Symmetry: C2
Subunit: 52 residues, 2 copies
């Protein structure tokens, strides 16, 4: 369903949103995305997916 | 491709393998699995997926 969607995520002690990570997984209330070489997971509530 | 595969994962300071978490994502060298209610990610090298 997805290919290249720019996902942005917030931070605990950081209000601003994080760069457009690479979409890897999107199911439950958490989303898995890669910022560069490492894969991170952030709650869907604190994340925002977008289309390139 | 997957439905209900029992995934086991090792730990840093723990040699033994962790319970059969729920399979959520499996792509790069990391695998996303849920132990109960929270979702965790462990390197494929330190993980082992299995069929129920």
């Amino acid at each position: 369903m997805i290919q290249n969607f720019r996902v942005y995520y917030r931070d605990s002690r950081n209000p601003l949103w994080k760069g457009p990570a690479k979409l890897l997984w999107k199911g439950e209330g958490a989303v898995v995305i890669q910022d560069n070489s490492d894969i991170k997971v952030v709650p869907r509530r604190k994340a925002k997916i977008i289309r390139d």
